[PDB]
Design a protein around this ligand. Structure first.
Ligand SMILES: Nc1ncnc2c1ncn2[C@@H]1O[C@H](COP(=O)(O)OP(=O)(O)NP(=O)(O)O)[C@@H](O)[C@H]1O
Ligand SMILES: Nc1ncnc2c1ncn2[C@@H]1O[C@H](COP(=O)(O)OP(=O)(O)NP(=O)(O)O)[C@@H](O)[C@H]1O
Ligand SMILES: [Mg+2]
Ligand SMILES: [Mg+2]
Ligand SMILES: [Zn+2]
Ligand SMILES: [Zn+2]
Lengths: 669, 97, 665, 434, 52
DNA sequence: CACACACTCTCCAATTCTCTAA
DNA sequence: TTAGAGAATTGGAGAGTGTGTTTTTTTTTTTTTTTTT
């Protein structure tokens, strides 16, 4: 009594392939129905290690965001109904074509009529278990799913591409059948149903539907490219909801379908029957974080789950959360709590302000690590590159005026001018880290002056006249004149910089590597223990390695590093603290004292941009407590940071007088 | 950085990644060119921001440097720190002399 | 209609998954209700392909791999389950599903034919279904190395164990089933290509003939793999015991098998008459001599060098020819002047049966490995010494009764089987002396001579050439046998007396029509005629009168047309032709019958350095014949100048002039 | 189908003739007032179209490219009725739209919007020369010499493949003498700086306007557009085609005057506010405190920035000698003194201005640069910051960090008010009075 | 398992009696097995030939 | 556009096939 | 059995249709990086 064309199989039965290819098996109607029900049952019945329905939590977020794309983790298929994980790797172009319909029905169970919001859902497969460089791809990958790493090197505009097309025949019918269009090659039809002979056509205008299209040239990552040998590339194609996901110069990781097609230009110039190859992208991830890490799944390492936001809210009300977070900045670097304090403030930032639309104030905190050799100035900066959301690193003679900032490119083909963004654009809403800042050329170093305060880059070159945004915090590391700090001199004589750039930095840290027989025991003990703990030879393995990684990390740090990375991004994106105005007498007397004692000739350039700094730093401490309001304890911690950093920059001949004069502000916390 | 789009041309410290870069005439090297190795000696990476090509590159290289005193003769009246035009930032990078 | 096709595919795919699977605990497990699924699939084959002549079920059972993924594993596991028990010496249930698996193997492997009576849907699928049959043969021969052929002989042993008398017809049926299974696995053979000719050719021809599926090589299907898998699975020992145990029901399947794997083996490879390196070397020296002749015809400078010749001719007028080679060689100049002509006269050029010695190229040879070649020759030597004599005696009775029912396929597989075995066993007894000739003594018995001669006569009279060709082959072999036994020593005289009037006229007419048919037909007529004339000469009704029945222009025409193919002939066949021309010239003094121009061109084209090899035994007697021919031609021309036109044209029949032309008073 | 178009047309004639608020027939009156001064267009505010009959707005917004050109003919039929005596001609009227639909950010335009009326905003970075599109082709056959014509409306037609009445496969030539044409202009619009996503280059659209919307803007102006987001099949991927906007209504935000020969574009309700303000006895106190109100002190710098925003007076002598009327000011000083915050303020108060950094600048990028056009392969001249800022203020921050070769290019443009060029066979003196 | 294809075999001859230079190349040796010594200036992507 | 090449379509007569009487 | 008259199929003339073709490419300005100035 069942319809013979409708009848179905079992999970036992799918493995017994009985067709000449997976392509031919997956497309048979009874097989297709069985696959759909299995994939449906995976999304409905799978639950987390904690026992929550993770794909319910993903579907909630899908329909609330009105997102068209559902993230699915490949490990969750390898851990349950694993033949589906196998077919998905072997022939994704047919398997995803079913799993997109199953995902539509899985979300429509939750949100009836979501069809009126999007007609279709796309599955963004994540954490695919094997990875290739672009050099390692071979013909045996064709039509299979790949995961691949590279630098997105060109990224064309976003265009409407035709998706469903009817055709007009010139001879007869305005209705040739609706071809779904393949994103690789022309329609090539050679026939008409309304007239059974060859003839001309026009693409029909009664109905069509469009999808967004964008190519991306993806090249090998220069740290995996063997030196002196050329980087390889591939064309990548991004379709609807994947367009505009990555910016030129990011290290990107793609999952997608490796495909090939005939084109005559290859066959013409190469003289062999050779086919061009294209990765149709199915998901994209950006290779931020430390990357030598198993504990960090998903397409976005700085996303949080609801059980993670609730954990941030819990710890944010720990008494002493600021001093726990500060102790967790570079937890394997001993001492330097003033640098860790300055790094914490710069890494959370203040609040940017606009006043009636007329005027604006800088919210980012800039930091100068000035000091002696072998003192973790460069290790502190390399830690902030792992820890910050968007970050860029640059060094001395390796950084130019317009490799920072921005430059104008001339195309070789269309051969008119365009902008390429520098390090202060690619770190926008983020940090730029400038190692050996004293050893930059003055012509290169003075490119930063606009991006410090106005947080913009105003180019007028080659008839391009415009302004980019450049809201970075800048952290810089430098050595004094002669390579060593000389404590009897004023700051303006210890350094080759000048007042306009020294005043743009709004925390200064001076590091003196003085000999002491007990601090050098405490430091040497910590460094010896840090080598033994970090040694590369010191309930299944993919989980079992995480209990030892957690053991070793929590010896050093008050807070897990994975939690602190997400806690910082959360505090930067959600929290924007306001001021109660009870500060007026403290901050005004601090500024008046700091200005009056700055009559000394070579002293630090305390300026109105250094009153304004106390207000930024107070907002950064309120962000660390995850508060929407600055307290008087944040105003005291900020005045202590700014007064201590001013007093530590003075010559030993007046440091006693200044510690004695400022005691009500230095001893305030 | 090479053009005509910009790209990376590998240098002596990258071509020796996971091996030894041997540098002769070291004291006769211009100090403006000497300072370029301070990241590659210690942080073992070269990082770049020029035109349209920001980058970070491996330089996991041991350095062996040969030098002459300023004046040719090792002035035996002086500690090593005075015979040689090097400053504390690079003098502290070499493990032993 | 197309809904019916996709519902049929869906129903058969759901039956195909219902049979069983690897179990994954791999050891294939029977599905519950497997017998009912097998019986239902047999019902599907019958109740569609018999009832509606469609082939659609037989096509779609290959799509879902039922043979290679279910029927083969089921038979091979059941074979192991019975082998183990025999070495220990519900099995009554598993018998029924083993039998029904063999039943479906025979249905799926059954030979395909296309005919006038063929369906519009069968002719559509024919060329495709031959590919799936090629995959079935590869899989049957290689899947666990022919263990399924071992399972087939086991199902035959199950009925060989019970007596020749006390057996039931429902078991003699199983014997015929197993024999039909082997003939099918043998006679899966790669298909014909076919083109629609309603629309004329483009500026290239048929750019590939290659009728093979994506994962089959030509070697996976060859008799080498067949012989290998038969010897490893003791199939030959089964066939040999079976063909000896004949002391009616099965004789015709058994002859069919012996035809289907003797057909394309030219026997001479079975007798050789560092060795492979010496053989390679001699052939490279012949190709070197050919390339030396091509180099002697090629430009000593580049293609563009441009030298241009003018040839003065009678009537004191010019032609022109390009190329440095033409300047020095007058013969090359005239050859080039003919080569460039843009005219060609239109040529004229010429059924359900397998490719065989009737149809395959004269040069074709199948390359046995050295173990395969010894395993084959030892099998057929045992078969000849045991069972050929009784097997031929049995089927020649069954077909002397019942002649009119033999559709052309039975008629060929009888005639060719008779000829091939008698030729092989004559040749074995030529080289080996311990081979008896008289082991095939049945071939000359009066009942078989009468059958072969009747059958050829009826095929000639009904104009069925494929059967007349097969008749001519078998008659040529019977004549070889008669001549051999006469030389060895009254049955010779009985057959030799039996053709005196009418078969003489038939065998004289055969070469007169020969010029209208394929090279293999002309070859057979020439080998037959050589043998006949050698017999009648040895016996002496009147040699002069009977050979004068052959000395007529139409025979000389087919001899010239066979000799035009000489670049692909062998020295044996050229020696047969020139023996006949020597017979016409010297023994008859007929010589005017051969003076026509077609022979003069053909002698030059083969006596040329570009023609026959100079070191060939074949060239020596052509050179000798040509010297005698030109002497008699010079004499005739000096005596009668009109012969320059008479040599250009066919001969006359106006009486007085026709006699004078032929003999010179 | 032409029964259906006749009902759509009849329903919009009745919108013009019946739509009234208070005593006044505001679209009949606007048509007549536009006919007399000879602009053949109507501006329609879409809240009024929704108020009259929402089914018409539904029709219009479902498929604009097929309904806009039906409302243009409905406007012409009313334009004849209200301005010519029957039984005793006008061109095809333009329809211009005003809207308060939500602005779509320029980067959020995607396949969901193709063929829809879309309102957005941006900075005009470029304007082309005018080009001629046809609105009426006169037509004649090559072979039989039959003659006819093709009315054209410029949304999403070509020469007929058949003679209309062997006459041939492509029979028609255009009679240029009897054809009629309209102006078309291309703009390019960048998105607004405060709407660019983090770390991206500001995105760009090309777009087209025609008739009375041409010349209504200049490079650097901030505009809001209403238009049809649409596609064209450029020859410059697969099954892919380029997006653009058919502009239906430019609306410049501050009444920044566009291409403008000082003409009297002000209105009496603001001119009488200015003519009272001029006569306030405290006016220079009011304007001084209105400069950068969040910057404390610097009173003389504010007083001088007020002088710079007015300038002096330009003079032209009977000698032919030209006197500079523009005032130039240098803020030379210590760090953190509000020099750059005052430059970022004068960029916003001045009706035309450009902020730039001397370190981010070139001689060519400041004055004018010679480009090479990739199609003609000819050189052509493009204006830099001094030409973009012409008639206004250029703010040059970090003027001490400008290269000595780049600072010198400014010497002519600060005194003689020109940019002289002699490059690639171009030579000109461009005006630049800043 | 699915069906797995025909395997293609790369026969790799080596250790020839003699080596030719790029300047020794002559069309007379077309279709014959040589060995060639040289230095690589460039290498292309690894691309798929349509073989069968 | 117009003029060569590439390629298909269609008709006509030239040749060979088949049957009959001399 | 030859030979000659009438029937069928194939070759190719030639008419018809359809497609591509010009073609360049340095020069002159503007920029951004290395190094040799
Ligand atoms: N306080 C510290 N605690 C632990 N390790 C340290 C400390 N100070 C320095 N080190 C280690 O010693 C090395 C020197 O740090 P590094 O960041 O390279 O020095 P630096 O301060 O930037 N000096 P320099 O490059 O010469 O200006 C690194 O391997 C650090 O890990
Ligand atoms: N007088 C002031 N009144 C109000 N805010 C001020 C004042 N002076 C300085 N500031 C603020 O402090 C910062 C000064 O930076 P900026 O205006 O860029 O300094 P600048 O004069 O251009 N100095 P510089 O670029 O170093 O030569 C801005 O955020 C100002 O709003
Ligand atoms: Mg360092
Ligand atoms: Mg400033
Ligand atoms: Zn059609
Ligand atoms: Zn006409």
């Amino acid at each position: 009594d069942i319809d013979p064309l409708r009848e179905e199989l079992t999970l036992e039965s799918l493995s017994n392939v009985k067709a000449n290819s997976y392509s031919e098996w997956i497309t048979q109607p009874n097989v297709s129905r069985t696959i759909a029900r299995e994939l449906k049952s995976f999304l409905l019945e799978y639950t987390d290690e904690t026992g929550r329905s993770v794909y319910g939590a993903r579907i909630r977020t899908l329909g609330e965001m009105n997102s068209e794309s559902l993230e699915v983790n490949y490990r969750h298929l390898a851990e349950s109904k694993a033949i589906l994980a196998l077919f998905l790797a072997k022939c994704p172009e047919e398997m995803l074509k079913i799993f997109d319909l199953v995902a539509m029905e899985a979300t429509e169970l939750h949100y009836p009529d979501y069809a009126r919001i999007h007609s279709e859902i796309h599955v963004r497969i994540s954490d695919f278990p094997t990875i290739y460089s672009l050099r390692e791809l071979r013909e045996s990958n064709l039509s299979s799913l790949v995961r691949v790493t590279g630098v997105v090197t060109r990224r064309t505009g976003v265009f409407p591409q035709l998706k469903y097309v009817k055709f007009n025949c010139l001879k007869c019918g305005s209705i040739l059948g609706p071809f779904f269009q393949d994103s690789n090659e022309e329609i090539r039809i050679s026939f008409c149903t309304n007239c059974k002979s060859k003839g001309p056509f026009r693409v029909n205008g009664e109905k069509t539907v469009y999808r967004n299209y964008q190519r991306v040239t993806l090249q090998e990552a220069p740290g995996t490219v063997p030196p002196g040998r050329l980087p390889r590339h591939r064309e990548v194609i991004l379709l609807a909801d994947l367009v505009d996901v990555s910016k030129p110069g990011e290290e990107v990781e793609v999952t997608g379908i490796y495909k090939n097609n005939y084109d005559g230009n290859l066959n013409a110039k190469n003289g062999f029957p050779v086919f061009a190859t294209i990765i149709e992208a199915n998901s994209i991830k950006r290779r931020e974080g430390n990357t030598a890490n198993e504990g960090e799944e998903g397409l976005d390492v700085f996303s949080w789950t609801e059980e993670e936001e609730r954990e941030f809210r819990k710890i944010s009300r720990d008494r002493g959360i600021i001093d726990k977070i500060i102790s967790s900045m570079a937890p394997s670097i001993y001492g330097h709590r003033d640098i860790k304090t300055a790094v914490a403030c710069s890494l959370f930032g203040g609040v940017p302000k606009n006043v009636n639309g007329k005027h604006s104030i800088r919210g980012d905190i800039n930091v100068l690590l000035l000091g002696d050799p072998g003192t973790a100035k460069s290790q502190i900066l390399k830690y902030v590159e792992k820890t910050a959301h968007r970050a860029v690193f640059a060094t001395g003679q390796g950084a130019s005026a317009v490799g920072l900032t921005a430059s104008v490119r001339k195309d070789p083909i269309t051969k008119e001018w365009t902008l390429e963004g520098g390090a202060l654009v690619l770190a926008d809403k983020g940090v730029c880290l400038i190692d050996e800042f004293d050893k930059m050329n003055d012509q290169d170093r003075t490119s930063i002056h606009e991006a410090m305060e106005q947080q913009s880059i105003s180019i007028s070159k080659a008839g391009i006249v415009t302004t980019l945004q450049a809201r970075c915090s800048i952290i810089a590391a430098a050595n004094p004149n002669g390579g060593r700090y000389n404590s009897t001199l004023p700051l303006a004589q210890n350094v080759s910089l000048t007042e306009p750039i020294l005043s743009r930095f709004d925390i200064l840290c001076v590091v003196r590597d003085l000999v002491d027989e007990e601090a050098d025991e405490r430091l040497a003990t910590f460094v010896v223990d840090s080598h033994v703990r970090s040694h590369p030879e010191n309930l299944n393995a993919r989980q079992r390695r995480l209990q030892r990684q957690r053991k070793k990390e929590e010896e050093i740090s008050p807070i897990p590093q994975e939690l602190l990375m997400k806690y910082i991004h959360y505090a930067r994106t959600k929290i924007y603290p306001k001021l109660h105005q009870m500060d007026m007498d403290k901050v005004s007397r601090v500024y008046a004292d700091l200005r009056r004692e700055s009559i000394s000739t070579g002293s630090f350039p305390i300026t109105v941009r250094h009153l304004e700094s106390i207000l930024r730093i107070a907002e950064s401490f309120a962000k660390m407590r995850l508060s929407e309001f600055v307290s008087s304890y944040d105003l005291d911690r900020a005045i202590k940071v700014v007064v201590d950093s001013f007093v530590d920059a003075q010559k030993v001949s007046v440091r006693r007088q200044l510690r004695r004069s400022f005691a009500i502000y230095t001893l305030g916390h | 950085v090479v053009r005509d789009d910009y790209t990376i041309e590998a240098g002596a410290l990258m071509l020796a990644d996971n091996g030894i870069c041997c540098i002769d005439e070291f004291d006769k090297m211009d100090i403006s060119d000497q300072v370029a190795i301070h990241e590659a000696m210690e942080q073992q990476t070269i990082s770049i921001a020029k035109a349209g090509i920001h980058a970070t590159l491996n330089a996991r290289t041991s350095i062996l440097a040969a030098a002459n005193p300023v004046g040719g003769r090792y002035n035996r009246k002086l500690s090593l720190r005075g015979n040689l035009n090097m400053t504390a930032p690079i003098m502290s990078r070499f493990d032993l002399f | 209609a197309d809904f019916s096709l996709t519902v049929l595919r869906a129903r058969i795919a759901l039956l195909a998954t219902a049979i069983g699977g690897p179990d994954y605990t791999p050891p294939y497990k029977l599905g519950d209700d497997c017998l009912a699924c097998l019986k239902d699939l047999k019902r599907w084959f019958k109740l569609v392909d018999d009832q509606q002549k469609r082939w659609d079920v037989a096509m779609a059972v290959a799509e879902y791999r039922i043979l290679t993924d279910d029927l083969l594993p089921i038979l091979i596991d059941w074979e192991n389950k019975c082998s183990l028990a025999a070495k220990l010496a519900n099995k009554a249930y598993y018998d029924k599903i083993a039998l029904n698996c063999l039943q479906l193997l025979v249905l799926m492997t059954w030979p395909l034919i296309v005919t006038e009576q063929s369906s519009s849907n069968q002719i559509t699928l024919y060329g495709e279904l031959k590919k799936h049959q090629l995959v079935y043969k590869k899989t049957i021969l290689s899947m666990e190395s022919g263990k399924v052929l071992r399972a087939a002989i086991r199902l035959a042993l199950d009925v060989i164990k019970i007596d020749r008398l006390s057996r039931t017809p429902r078991d003699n049926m199983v014997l015929k089933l197993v024999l039909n299974f082997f003939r099918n696995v043998i006679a899966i053979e790669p298909g014909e290509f076919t083109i629609n000719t309603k629309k004329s050719m483009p500026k290239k021809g048929i750019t590939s003939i290659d009728t093979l599926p994506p994962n089959v090589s030509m070697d996976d299907i060859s008799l080498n793999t067949v012989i290998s898998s038969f010897h490893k699975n003791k199939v030959f020992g089964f066939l040999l015991t079976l063909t000896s145990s004949l002391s009616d029901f099965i004789n015709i399947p058994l002859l069919e098998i012996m035809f289907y794997f003797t057909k394309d083996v030219n026997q001479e490879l079975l007798f050789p008459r560092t060795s492979a390196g010496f053989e390679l070397s001699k052939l490279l020296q012949k190709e070197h001599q050919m390339r030396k002749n091509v180099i002697k015809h090629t430009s000593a400078r580049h293609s563009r060098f441009g030298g241009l010749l003018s040839i003065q001719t009678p009537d004191k007028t010019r032609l022109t020819v390009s190329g440095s080679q033409a300047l020095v060689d007058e013969k090359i100049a005239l050859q080039k002047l003919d080569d460039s002509k843009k005219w060609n006269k239109r040529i004229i050029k010429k059924e359900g049966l397998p490719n065989s010695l009737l149809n395959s190229q004269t040069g074709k040879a199948i390359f046995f490995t050295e173990s395969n070649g010894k395993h084959f020759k030892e099998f057929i030597n045992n078969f000849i010494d045991s069972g050929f004599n009784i097997l031929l005696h049995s089927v020649t009775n069954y077909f002397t009764t019942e002649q009119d029912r033999m559709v052309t396929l039975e008629q060929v597989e009888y005639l060719l089987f008779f000829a091939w075995f008698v030729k092989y066993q004559l040749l074995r007894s030529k080289i080996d002396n311990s081979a008896d000739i008289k082991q095939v003594s049945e071939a000359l018995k009066e009942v078989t001579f009468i059958l072969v001669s009747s059958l050829l006569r009826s095929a000639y009279d009904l104009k069925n050439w494929t059967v007349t060709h097969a008749g001519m082959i078998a008659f040529n072999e019977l004549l070889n046998l008669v001549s051999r036994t006469k030389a060895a020593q009254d049955i010779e005289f009985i057959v030799s007396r039996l053709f005196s009037d009418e078969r003489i006229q038939l065998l004289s007419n055969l070469p007169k029509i020969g010029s209208k048919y394929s090279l293999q037909f002309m070859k057979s007529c020439i080998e037959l005629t050589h043998s006949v004339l050698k017999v009648l000469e040895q016996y002496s009704v009147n040699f002069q009168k009977v050979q004068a029945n052959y000395m007529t222009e139409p025979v000389i025409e087919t001899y010239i047309n066979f000799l035009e193919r000489f670049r692909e002939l062998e020295d044996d066949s050229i020696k047969k032709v020139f023996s006949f021309f020597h017979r016409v010239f010297v023994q008859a003094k007929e010589q005017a019958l051969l003076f026509r121009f077609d022979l003069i061109i053909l002698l030059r084209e083969m006596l040329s350095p570009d023609g026959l090899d100079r070191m060939s035994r074949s060239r020596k007697y052509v050179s000798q014949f040509s010297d005698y021919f030109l002497a008699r031609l010079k004499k005739r021309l000096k005596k009668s100048p009109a012969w320059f036109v008479g040599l250009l044209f066919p001969p006359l029949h106006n009486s007085e002039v026709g006699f004078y032309q032929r003999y010179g008073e | 189908n032409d029964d259906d178009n006749t009902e759509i047309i009849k329903s919009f004639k009745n919108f013009i003739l019946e739509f009234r608020l208070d005593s006044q027939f505001i679209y009949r009156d606007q048509l007549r007032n536009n006919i007399l001064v000879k602009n053949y267009s109507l501006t329609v505010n879409m809240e009024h179209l929704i108020g009259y009959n929402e089914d018409i707005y539904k029709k219009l917004s479902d498929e604009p490219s097929d309904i806009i050109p039906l409302f243009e003919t409905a406007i012409t039929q009313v334009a004849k009725r209200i301005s010519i005596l029957s039984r005793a001609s006008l061109p095809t009227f333009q329809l211009i739209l005003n809207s308060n639909a939500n602005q779509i950010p320029l980067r959020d335009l995607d396949s969901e919007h193709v063929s829809k009326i879309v309102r957005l905003s941006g900075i005009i970075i470029s304007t082309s020369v005018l080009s001629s599109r046809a609105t009426y082709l006169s037509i004649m056959c090559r072979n039989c010499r039959h003659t006819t014509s093709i009315t054209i409306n410029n949304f999403n037609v070509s020469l007929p493949r058949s003679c209309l009445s062997n006459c041939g496969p492509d029979p028609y030539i255009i009679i240029h003498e009897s054809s009629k044409f309209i102006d078309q202009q291309f703009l390019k619009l960048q998105e607004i700086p405060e709407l660019v996503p983090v770390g991206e280059m500001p995105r760009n659209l090309t777009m087209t306007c025609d008739r009375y919307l041409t010349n209504k803007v200049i490079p650097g102006t901030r505009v809001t557009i209403v238009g049809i987001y649409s596609i064209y099949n450029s020859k410059n991927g697969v099954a892919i085609r380029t997006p653009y906007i058919k502009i239906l209504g430019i609306q410049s935000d501050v009444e920044t005057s566009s291409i403008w020969n000082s003409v009297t574009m002000f209105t009496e309700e603001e001119e009488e506010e200015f003519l009272q303000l001029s006569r306030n006895p405290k006016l220079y106190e009011i304007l001084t405190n209105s400069i950068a109100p969040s910057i404390f002190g610097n009173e003389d710098i504010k007083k001088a920035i007020v002088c710079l925003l007015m300038g002096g007076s330009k003079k032209i002598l009977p000698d032919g000698m030209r006197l500079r009327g523009d005032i130039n000011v240098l803020l030379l000083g210590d760090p953190g003194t509000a020099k750059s915050q005052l430059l970022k303020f004068v960029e916003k108060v001045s009706p035309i201005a450009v902020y730039t950094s001397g370190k981010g600048s070139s001689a060519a990028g400041l004055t004018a640069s010679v480009q090479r056009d990739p199609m003609t392969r000819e050189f052509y001249l493009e204006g830099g910051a001094m030409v973009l800022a012409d008639g206004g203020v250029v703010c040059i921050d970090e003027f001490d960090k400008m290269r000595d070769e780049d600072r010198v290019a400014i010497h002519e443009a600060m005194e003689q008010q020109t940019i002289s060029i002699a490059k690639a066979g171009i030579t000109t003196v461009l005006n630049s009075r800043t | 398992s699915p069906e797995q294809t025909e395997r293609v075999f790369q026969i790799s001859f080596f250790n020839l009696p003699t080596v030719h230079r790029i300047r020794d190349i002559r069309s007379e040796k077309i279709g014959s097995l040589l060995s060639i010594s040289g230095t690589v200036t460039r290498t292309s992507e690894v691309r798929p030939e349509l073989y069968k």
